Amino acid sequence: PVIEALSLNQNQLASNGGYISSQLGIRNESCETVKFKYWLSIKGPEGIYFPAKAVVGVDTAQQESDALLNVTRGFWVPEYMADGKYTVSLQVVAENGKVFKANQEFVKGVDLNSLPELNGLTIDIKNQFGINSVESTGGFVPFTVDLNNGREGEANVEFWMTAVGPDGLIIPVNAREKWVIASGDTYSKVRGINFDKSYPAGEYTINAQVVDIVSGERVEQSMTVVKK
Amino acid sequence: PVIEANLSLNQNQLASNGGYISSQLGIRNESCETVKFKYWLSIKGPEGIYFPAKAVVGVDTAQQESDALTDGRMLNVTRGFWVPEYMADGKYTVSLQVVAENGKVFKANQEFVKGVDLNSLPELNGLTIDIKNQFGINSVESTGGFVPFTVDLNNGREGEANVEFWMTAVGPDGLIIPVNAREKWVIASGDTYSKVRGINFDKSYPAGEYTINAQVVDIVSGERVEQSMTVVKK
Ligand SMILES: [Mg+2]
């Protein structure tokens, strides 16, 4: 690796938001000097994406290279942004096109170390065997889905999954299903996606959504699989 | 082109209570030889929503199956979907997507709106948001290129608007490239915040599709609106 790339001072914010301070480390392990560009960005719920940089005036700058690093950057997460899971991403693009990323999570207005949930309905969706990539010639990745209703009454849920990938692909992974889950019951399945040989190389976000139809609240779970 | 894809929607405007959209899908094999492909219909919406057109009464157990079209022959199917009241008001894109056996991707897209006017600017309660690819540059070379965007935030309200604004490029390999840092503006009644802002796609950046994504927030109401535009790096 020509580059090795993050830690956050805290990983839990309340719904009123707060400040996250991040320590960025970029090491040049290789024999030669390396030129790269780097930045810090955030991905959140409800399609939020934002740069860690905030400015008091007009942003006039462009992405400058460095050459080889230890810097600290902090950002505010305002109350208005959605409650849920955020990913902070230090990203480095080396002159030769190799991309390096270091990611860490924080949560806003939900418990770290508890499952995602819709008011007692708990959502446990996982890459079953931790398969983070498949070959260009194709591969299959199964995902476990457990929707456990911890409420006193029955929960009316809707559930689907897509693979959001290269070339603007949005591949159906699970069609939209609707379930009435009794108090104390669980909806469980294993669902896989076959990445056909024909599908483009690159990064796919397996994106599960669960909706409580009565409250209208929606929660996402995103998992990444790379097709080489 | 080994495939030509066509899509049309029976209507392009829904109320906030939602409704049903019926879509006509056309896939034509123009080429000399028989072609094998897979295809599907998906929707992208506000607030990070993505969903498949298909809904099932039980447990979805099926996988994406291939179809085949002989020389000159075509496929015509009609598919519909419900857009429930709970999904966000704003702009939606319906996408018919075809992946041919050889890896070539073909797409036909159409827009509909929910709870907003078709043919009006995105807005936050009288604050209008007009963000555009300035010269209609939809792609840049692998060796690099620069694309400028115009930003016009016109405050049509009686009072001043307190806005926050930023832009990223969401691209291949999970890149989220800063394009405009987070700025805050106080725009007086009747004024416009205008700027031109560009992104340099350096040679080093990966080939593929970049969504230039602008977000505008009314800091007082806490309402947020996006505008997305696509640039392909070859
Ligand atoms: Mg209508």
Side-chain angles (χ1 to χ4, degrees), chain A residues 1 3 5-26 28 31 34 36-52 54-55 57-59 61-63 65 67 69-72 74-84 86-97 99-104 106-151 153-196 198-228, chain B residues 1 3 5-24 26-27 29 31-32 34-64 66 68-70 72 74-90 92-103 105-117 120-202 204-234:
Chain A
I3 291 286
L6 182 66
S7 80
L8 302 183
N9 72 323
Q10 61 174 340
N11 304 86
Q12 164 77 75
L13 302 181
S15 297
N16 88 127
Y19 179 78
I20 289 194
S21 167
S22 65
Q23 205 69 229
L24 317 189
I26 302 175
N28 180 12
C31 301
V34 65
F36 56 94
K37 292 180 192 295
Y38 81 99
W39 49 80
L40 192 72
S41 288
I42 298 88
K43 177 184 168 63
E46 302 183 354
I48 279 149
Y49 294 94
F50 66 96
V55 301
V58 174
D59 179 21
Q62 203 62 49
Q63 285 305 147
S65 290
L69 182 59
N70 276 112
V71 70
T72 142
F75 56 92
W76 286 95
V77 178
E79 173 158 3
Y80 70 70
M81 284 184 186
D83 286 349
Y86 289 72
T87 300
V88 183
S89 189
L90 163 63
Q91 321 196 311
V92 184
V93 180
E95 196 195 357
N96 71 350
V99 176
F100 302 86
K101 290 175 285 167
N103 296 170
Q104 301 294 171
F106 71 85
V107 296
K108 181 178 175 279
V110 298
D111 189 36
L112 210 235
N113 307 132
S114 291
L115 293 169
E117 73 164 66
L118 298 168
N119 191 54
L121 177 85
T122 230
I123 295 137
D124 189 356
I125 299 184
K126 298 182 201 300
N127 184 315
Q128 182 171 22
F129 301 112
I131 296 162
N132 307 123
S133 55
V134 300
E135 288 189 314
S136 59
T137 47
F140 183 89
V141 183
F143 293 85
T144 55
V145 178
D146 292 280
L147 274 32
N148 169 43
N149 182 7
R151 306 172 178 172
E154 77 191 7
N156 289 246
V157 307
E158 188 165 11
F159 158 77
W160 63 87
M161 297 171 76
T162 60
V164 176
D167 302 335
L169 295 181
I170 303 159
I171 312 191
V173 167
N174 204 290
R176 292 165 64 183
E177 302 180 9
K178 294 180 52 88
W179 297 108
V180 172
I181 303 163
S183 186
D185 286 357
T186 300
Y187 177 78
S188 289
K189 75 190 288 174
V190 171
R191 183 57 170 154
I193 167 162
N194 187 44
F195 290 86
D196 190 84
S198 67
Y199 295 177
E203 191 166 299
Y204 291 76
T205 306
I206 305 308
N207 179 74
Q209 308 203 174
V210 184
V211 182
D212 176 338
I213 255 60
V214 175
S215 66
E217 299 296 341
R218 176 167 61 85
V219 76
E220 297 179 46
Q221 178 74 60
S222 281
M223 293 148 289
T224 101
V225 175
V226 176
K227 182 160 186 286
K228 299 290 173 71
Chain B
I3 292 286
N6 303 292
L7 175 67
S8 80
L9 302 183
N10 71 327
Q11 61 175 339
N12 303 83
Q13 162 79 73
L14 303 180
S16 297
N17 87 123
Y20 186 81
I21 289 192
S22 165
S23 65
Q24 205 69 227
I27 302 175
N29 181 13
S31 63
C32 311
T34 291
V35 65
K36 224 180 91 160
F37 56 93
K38 293 180 192 296
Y39 80 99
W40 49 80
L41 192 72
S42 289
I43 299 87
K44 177 184 168 64
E47 302 183 353
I49 205 146
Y50 293 94
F51 66 94
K54 196 170 182 185
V56 301
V57 69
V59 171
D60 181 20
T61 245
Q63 203 62 50
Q64 284 305 150
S66 291
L69 280 169
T70 313
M74 94 169 289
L75 180 59
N76 270 299
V77 71
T78 143
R79 307 282 183 80
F81 57 92
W82 284 95
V83 178
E85 172 158 4
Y86 70 71
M87 286 183 187
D89 285 350
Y92 288 74
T93 300
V94 182
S95 190
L96 163 62
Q97 322 196 312
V98 183
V99 180
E101 196 195 358
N102 72 349
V105 178
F106 303 90
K107 289 176 284 168
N109 296 169
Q110 301 294 174
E111 298 183 337
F112 71 85
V113 296
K114 182 178 174 278
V116 297
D117 291 347
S120 291
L121 293 168
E123 73 164 67
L124 299 168
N125 192 52
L127 178 84
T128 229
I129 294 136
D130 190 356
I131 298 184
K132 297 182 200 300
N133 186 311
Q134 182 170 26
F135 300 114
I137 297 161
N138 306 124
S139 55
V140 300
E141 288 189 314
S142 60
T143 46
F146 182 92
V147 184
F149 292 86
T150 57
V151 178
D152 293 280
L153 272 33
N154 170 43
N155 181 10
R157 307 173 178 172
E158 283 282 282
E160 78 192 10
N162 300 72
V163 307
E164 187 167 10
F165 158 82
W166 64 85
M167 298 172 75
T168 61
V170 175
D173 303 334
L175 294 182
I176 304 158
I177 310 191
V179 169
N180 204 291
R182 294 166 62 184
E183 300 189 32
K184 294 187 174 138
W185 296 108
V186 172
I187 305 165
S189 184
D191 284 359
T192 301
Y193 193 87
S194 291
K195 76 188 287 175
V196 171
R197 184 58 169 149
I199 168 162
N200 187 46
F201 293 86
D202 190 84
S204 67
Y205 295 177
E209 190 181 286
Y210 289 76
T211 303
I212 305 308
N213 179 77
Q215 309 202 172
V216 185
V217 180
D218 175 339
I219 273 142
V220 175
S221 68
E223 300 297 341
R224 176 170 62 85
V225 77
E226 297 177 48
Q227 178 73 58
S228 281
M229 292 149 288
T230 293
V231 175
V232 176
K233 182 159 187 287
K234 299 289 172 71

